Design a protein around this ligand. Structure first.
Ligand SMILES: *[C@@H]1O[C@H](CO)[C@@H](O[C@@H]2O[C@H](CO)[C@@H](O[C@@H]3O[C@H](CO)[C@@H](O)[C@H](O)[C@@H]3O)[C@H](O)[C@H]2NC(C)=O)[C@H](O)[C@H]1NC(C)=O
Ligand SMILES: CC(=O)N[C@@H]1[C@@H](O)[C@H](O)[C@@H](CO)O[C@H]1O
Ligand SMILES: *[C@H]1O[C@H](CO)[C@@H](O)[C@H](O)[C@H]1NC(C)=O
Lengths: 97, 1239
């Protein structure tokens, strides 16, 4: 299990699959998750910013205490139940698989 | 089809559909041909010379009947070709009346109405009536008797006399006692009336002359309604006649109009009868149905028929809608009786058929028919099977040109009516003239109207287009009584026609001596014989009447001076252009003096034209009208008197708690009903004795203008004829263009005169009729309040208390608003009334409007209007004000130092429009801030905003705050209260209550009686104050203040008044701008493209999703789907603003490239799947769309269909088809005020 602390991911487009990770106090700014697989990865206290989620398929992933701002969730299965005590800001939720 | 197997004429005599027939008659009648056309309906191709013995000849009688128009012919119907054409036409009219659903229900009602078999002298037996059956003689030699309902026979001696007759009985009055009998309709389809209509210019300003032919379908429908009344035995007594006064010279000499005609005409005419007589008729008919039900219960036997008594009882219980409670005890219920009576009386009317058929007809029976037109109906190229004379896809469809004789002249041929133009006439002398009878005022007598107002009333514990489709849905079918076997009657069926009451011949040639000129002299002074001699215009009637060659005119002296001058060949074109321009000049003149109440357009030259009030000067007429209101127009003042309304007596149940509250509730309800009834009586009196004179004046103006044009072009042609060959050939001229332009000038003047007469009538109603009722009625309120007070204290307390006295003081101190919307239909009248009240009340305290590049007060009270530097104005429309959260984003209004009082605001109101952006910053929660202030030194009012709510605060000197709030949630899928234009108004009665209204709907009331003294602010503040947000901004427009309290009526119409199409936000829709799309029927989905092209299509997918921010807002996404852009196709307006009825093209953006929207209309099915094509498309496909609804039109002008969607299998595709919804759409411009992020 890979523990991640204090990340600053700027302008990164993600295409591959990341699995078995936890992120804490992450600051994902201007990221982009397109056509990828989320497997057993956990987000806690992470502050998103204008990230874009497209055709992302998730399994056992769970967002916790995350501040999600200005994002777009288009063509995804990240339903409401996958978010726990999360605050959205100016965000949106488009058509979902 | 209703009529299958067209029967030609020369088919054999088989015996069930074509056979020889014996009709009942007093004497002997030879076998007569006829053709069964349906169940219980027969059509006889012969002239009616058998039913009535007195009519043995077809020669016109020496004494012509008192009829406006009539034609006579003795060789008609004689030959077999005429018989075939007659029968084809009547069959076509039957199928056409059956085509419409309302007509379908009427035909079913006719079919079901078999007469009752009550002819047995013995009470307990059922016997068929001998006089309501026909003897069908078979080729073998024997005959069989058969019952039926309707017989269609060619006309009587008077050809155009279409009527209904019935065979009476010695002691039983069948037509009015619930029994009913077979009806014989004297009818012909080959002839039509020709009338004149002058109220169509509102829809078709390009209309020429009138002379419209009434659709024969409507006439047959009128005859069928007469029949339908007579089968159910509900005909009104013929001796009940709407009598008129005939003593005066201006009063029409005489004409019979029975109440049955008033009922069958319906609509406007149906209002000529008061509610009391209608109630009497309803009660009488209910009693007669109770009697027939009792007789049916008593009877237990039948003689003369094969089928069971039970079967005939079932048929009759279905016909009369009776109910049997499983015990053989028939009974009628008031609900079903009321439904049937309304269906037969109010639903089946001529007006409703005219509305459904979309054909011309006179709105009132006063518009007497003026010509006889021979027509041909058998060919389909002249009279289409569906839409009548208005054939679709042709030039005749537009503007109802089919019924216009002067266009569709090859279809109608005029005939010479045998009633003389001046056979029935009156004489007027001062120099004597004659007047035709049918061109006089209609003066109803006072006896025809009655009231039960004086009768007192006691209250006990318990006292108390669409509708056509609901009745059709509820209506029953598949139950038509089958043909029945009966024992045959004698060879000859004896019988006498129902006796008609005698009408004495009205006197002719009466002489009246007067000391003044009447308008008939003036109307005659403008006529001429178009002889060879020159005709000269003049300004003196005394010479125009005497000299046949001189014609009176009411125009200016320079005009007559010009028209009397001889001119030469080179000068004539300038002469004709000058005269047409000058004629338009007089016809277009309107007075500018508008200080008079809602007579805004006073037209002067009506005075000298018709000698109204005995002045001959335009200025004198204007002064007289200004001084005397609308009274001077009326020839005779209609007397109105409202006697004292009866008191109200309440019963008392000693020691009661909930029944007494019911007593007060019923008292209030009966108060409201009494107010409604008295308004209805006042309206019907006004319509009976005021509107007819105004209509006659309008007709006289129309014919006067036409006569003036006639004289002008007559003298012009006289001058034209003077030339030699070279002048007339070198200098061309035609009369058609002159006639067209003069007629267009007549129409533009006639619009003004029609509107003027409309405000005249409405103003007279509002001024000199309603106060008389309202004074007695408020006295009734005073007495009723006294009674309720005596009961509310009764010096005792064993009762059930401040709430009751509050309610009684509230409602019995105010007045119910008066509207004709609930009394009249005439759309023209409707508009004038409401438009008036709102337009006049506009003038108020502050009318802050931005025009002429400045924000000014049109109410000329505001002292100064300060404008801050940081305010903003909308370039597309300068009347919008945008206010920012900065100090200089301020507007100050210096209120008039006159209207500022310490204890003012006793009754007053405010109204304006606000658009609010969507709250973003969380600090704005519970952050109240004032947006509009009129509060000084802890006293005044303020409008404030907070998180999703509007607050109106009233505040007195002694700290008593009163806050009324209107709230709305931000977490909703679709909102009508965010970023949208919202009408907000506040009404205040410092005596009773403060009320809030939003866009014209009731929200909240709070008491303000505890408020004391509320000192008036010196000025008005427009500024954000205390708003912690650094980006908050507002939009407001059309702010208005009212010095008196308003009412629901004046506020609702105001909304529409202040309301060019709008977008989602309510702002003006604009050209060459992108817009998203939204259908109101399906809000949760958006639009999407697929494989664009001819094969490509638009469809509905989703869900649109959701954008939200925690504990601030949640809402579905709005910027979904491809954006739509609109650009001009043929609109000539320079600006990019769209208006109503604008034909434009529609394009859509797909991956940042533009596509036309178009479809192929030749595809099968009414649904027309639209498609997205490239800009280089083919012009054959329909792409022009008219404008919240949009309609696609073919390149030839045919409407492809309303743009909407259809559920094509599992795909919600888009269509242009010809549903209560699906025609509603909405455009979403990109708005910075909403803030959702696109991508
Ligand atoms: C959520 O979105 C809203 C609107 O989409 C954001 O509010 C907006 O914030 C911007 C940036 O400050 C404001 O722009 C301003 O423009 C003026 C004129 O150019 C400029 O002088 C200012 O310095 C500022 O840049 C914009 O007015 C403002 N809109 C509203 C309606 O307030 C908001 O910040 C986003 N985030 C949150 C948490 O709400
Ligand atoms: C229980 C919890 O984890 N909540 C935290 C909250 O205390 C913190 O203020 C915020 C800012 O990072 O993130 C989240
Ligand atoms: C995702 O994009 C990267 C960068 O262009 C590319 O190297 C990679 O092959 C893509 N992902 C997959 C799994 O193909």
């Amino acid at each position: 299990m890979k523990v991640f602390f204090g990340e600053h991911v700027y302008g990164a487009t993600i295409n591959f699959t990341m699995e078995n990770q936890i992120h804490q106090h992450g600051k994902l700014v201007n990221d982009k998750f397109t056509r990828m697989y989320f497997k057993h990865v956990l987000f806690e206290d992470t502050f998103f910013d204008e990230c874009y989620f497209e055709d992302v398929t998730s399994t056992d992933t769970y967002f916790k205490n995350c501040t999600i701002e200005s994002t777009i969730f288009y063509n995804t299965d990240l339903y409401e139940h996958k978010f726990i005590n999360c605050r959205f800001i100016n965000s949106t939720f488009l058509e979902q698989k | 089809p209703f009529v299958n197997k067209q029967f030609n004429y020369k088919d054999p005599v088989n015996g069930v559909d074509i056979a020889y027939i014996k009709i009942p008659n007093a004497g002997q009648m030879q076998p007569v041909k006829a053709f069964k056309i349906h169940n219980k309906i027969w059509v006889i191709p012969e002239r009616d010379t058998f039913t009535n013995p007195e009519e043995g000849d077809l020669n016109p009688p020496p004494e012509a009947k008192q009829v406006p128009v009539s034609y006579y012919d003795s060789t008609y119907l004689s030959t077999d070709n005429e018989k075939d054409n007659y029968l084809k036409g009547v069959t076509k009219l039957f199928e056409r009346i059956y085509s419409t659903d309302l007509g379908r229900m009427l035909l079913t009602s006719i079919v079901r109405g078999i007469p009752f078999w009550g002819g047995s002298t013995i009470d307990t037996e059922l016997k068929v009536i001998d006089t309501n059956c026909i003897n069908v003689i078979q080729p073998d030699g024997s005959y069989r008797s058969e019952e039926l309902n309707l017989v269609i026979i060619g006309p009587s001696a008077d050809i155009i006399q279409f009527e209904c007759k019935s065979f009476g009985h010695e002691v039983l009055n069948l037509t009015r006692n619930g029994y009913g009998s077979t009806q014989y309709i004297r009818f012909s389809p080959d002839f039509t009336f020709g009338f004149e209509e002058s109220l169509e210019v509102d829809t078709n300003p390009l209309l020429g002359a009138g002379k419209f032919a009434t659709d024969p379908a409507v006439t047959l429908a009128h005859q069928l309604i007469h029949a339908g009344h007579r089968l159910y035995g509900i005909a009104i007594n013929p001796n009940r006649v709407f009598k008129v006064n005939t003593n005066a010279y201006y009063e029409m000499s005489g004409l019979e109009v029975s109440f049955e005609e008033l009922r069958t005409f319906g609509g406007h005419d149906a209002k000529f009868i008061d509610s009391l007589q209608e109630n009497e008729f309803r009660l009488y008919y209910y009693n007669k149905f109770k009697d027939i039900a009792s007789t049916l219960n008593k009877a237990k036997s039948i003689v003369g028929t094969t089928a069971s008594l039970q079967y005939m009882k079932n048929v009759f219980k279905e016909k009369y809608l009776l109910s049997e409670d499983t015990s053989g005890k028939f009974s009628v219920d008031k609900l079903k009786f009321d439904k049937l009576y309304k269906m037969l009386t109010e639903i089946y009317t001529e007006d409703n058929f005219v509305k459904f058929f979309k054909v011309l007809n006179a709105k009132t029976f006063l518009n007497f028919d003026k010509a006889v037109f021979k027509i041909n109906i058998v060919p389909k190229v002249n009279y289409t099977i569906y839409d009548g004379f208005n054939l679709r896809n042709t030039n005749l469809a537009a503007n109802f040109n089919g019924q216009n004789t002067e266009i569709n002249n090859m279809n109608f041929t005029k005939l010479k009516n045998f009633t003389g133009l001046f056979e029935f006439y009156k004489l007027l002398c001062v120099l004597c003239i004659k007047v035709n009878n049918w061109d006089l005022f209609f003066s109803p007598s006072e006896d025809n109207f009655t009231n039960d107002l004086n009768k007192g009333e006691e209250i006990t514990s318990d006292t108390n287009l669409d509708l056509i489709q609901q009745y059709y849905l509820t209506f029953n079918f598949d139950n038509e009584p089958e043909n029945i076997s009966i024992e045959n009657l004698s060879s000859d069926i004896i019988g006498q026609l129902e006796l008609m009451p005698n009408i004495e011949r009205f006197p002719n040639g009466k002489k009246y001596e007067l000391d003044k000129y009447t308008m008939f002299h003036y109307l005659r002074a403008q006529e001429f014989e178009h002889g060879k001699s020159r005709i000269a215009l003049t300004n003196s009637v005394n010479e125009a009447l005497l000299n046949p060659s001189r014609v009176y005119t009411f125009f200016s002296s320079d005009y007559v001076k010009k028209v009397n001058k001889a001119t030469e060949a080179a000068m004539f074109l300038g002469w004709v252009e000058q005269l047409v321009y000058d004629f338009t000049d007089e016809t277009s003149e309107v007075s500018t003096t508008d200080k008079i109440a809602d007579i805004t357009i006073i037209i002067p030259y009506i005075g000298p034209a018709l000698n109204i009030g005995n002045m001959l000067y335009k200025d004198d007429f204007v002064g007289a009208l200004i001084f005397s209101g609308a009274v001077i127009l009326l020839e005779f003042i209609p007397e109105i008197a409202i006697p004292v309304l009866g008191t109200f007596a309440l019963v008392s149940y000693i020691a009661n708690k909930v029944l007494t509250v019911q007593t007060i509730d019923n008292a209030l309800s009966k108060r409201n009903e009494k107010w409604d009834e008295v308004y209805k009586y006042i309206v019907t009196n006004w319509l009976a004795k005021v509107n007819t004179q105004i209509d006659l004046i309008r007709k006289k103006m129309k014919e006067a203008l036409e006569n003036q044009a006639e004289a002008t072009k007559a003298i012009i042609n006289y001058q034209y004829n003077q030339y030699t060959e070279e002048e007339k050939n070198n200098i061309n001229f035609n009369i058609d263009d002159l006639s067209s332009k003069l007629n267009e000038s007549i129409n533009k003047a006639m619009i003004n005169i029609n509107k003027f007469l409309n405000q005249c009538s409405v103003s007279y109603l509002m001024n000199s009729m309603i106060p008389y009722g309202v004074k007695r009625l408020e006295d009734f309120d005073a007495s009723l309040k006294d009674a309720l007070l005596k009961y509310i204290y009764d010096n005792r307390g064993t009762l059930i208390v401040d709430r009751l006295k509050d309610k009684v003081n509230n409602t019995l101190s105010t007045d119910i608003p008066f509207q004709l919307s609930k009394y009249v239909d005439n759309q023209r009248l409707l508009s004038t009334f409401t438009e008036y009240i709102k337009n006049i009340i506009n003038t108020s305290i502050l009318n802050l409007r931005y025009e002429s590049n400045h924000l000014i007060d049109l109410s000329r009270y505001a002292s100064k209007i300060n404008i801050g530097s940081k305010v903003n104005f909308d370039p597309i429309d300068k009347n919008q004000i945008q206010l920012f959260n900065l100090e200089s984003s301020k507007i100050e209004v210096i209120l008039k130092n006159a209207i500022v009082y310490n204890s003012m605001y006793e009754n007053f109101s405010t109204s304006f429009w606000i658009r609010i952006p969507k709250y973003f910053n969380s600090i704005s929660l519970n952050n109240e801030y004032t947006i509009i202030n009129c509060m000084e030194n802890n006293s005044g009012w303020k409008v404030s905003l907070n998180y999703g709510e509007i607050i109106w605060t009233l505040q007195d000197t002694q700290e008593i705050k009163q806050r009324v709030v209107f709230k709305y949630s931000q977490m909703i899928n679709i909102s009508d209260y965010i970023n949208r234009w919202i009408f907000v108004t506040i009404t205040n009665n410092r005596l009773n209550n403060s009320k809030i209204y939003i866009n014209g709907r009731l929200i909240d009331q709070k008491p303000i009686s505890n408020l004391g003294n509320i000192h008036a602010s010196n000025n008005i503040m427009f500024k954000l104050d205390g708003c912690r947000d650094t980006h908050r901004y507002i939009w407001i427009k059309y702010f208005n203040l009212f010095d008196k309290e308003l009412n629901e009526k004046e506020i609702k119409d105001l909304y529409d008044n202040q309301s060019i199409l709008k977008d989602f936000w309510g702002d003006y829709l604009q050209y060459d701008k992108p817009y998203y799309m939204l259908n109101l029927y399906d809000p949760n989905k958006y639009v999407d493209v697929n494989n664009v092209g001819i094969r490509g299509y638009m469809y509905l997918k989703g869900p649109r999703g959701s954008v939200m921010t925690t504990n601030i807002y949640l809402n579905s996404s709005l910027y979904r789907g491809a954006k739509f852009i609109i650009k001009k196709y043929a609109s000539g307006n320079k600006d990019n603003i769209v208006r109503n009825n604008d034909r434009v093209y529609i394009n859509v953006v797909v991956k940042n490239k533009e596509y036309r929207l178009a479809t192929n209309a030749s595809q099968a099915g009414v649904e027309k799947i639209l498609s997205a094509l490239e800009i280089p498309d083919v012009g054959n496909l329909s792409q022009v769309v008219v404008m919240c609804k949009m309609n696609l039109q073919d390149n030839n002008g045919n409407d492809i269909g309303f743009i909407g969607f259809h559920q094509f299998n599992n795909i919600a595709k888009l269509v242009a088809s010809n549903r209560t919804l699906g025609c509603s759409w909405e455009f979403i411009p990109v708005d910075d005020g909403w803030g959702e992020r696109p991508l």
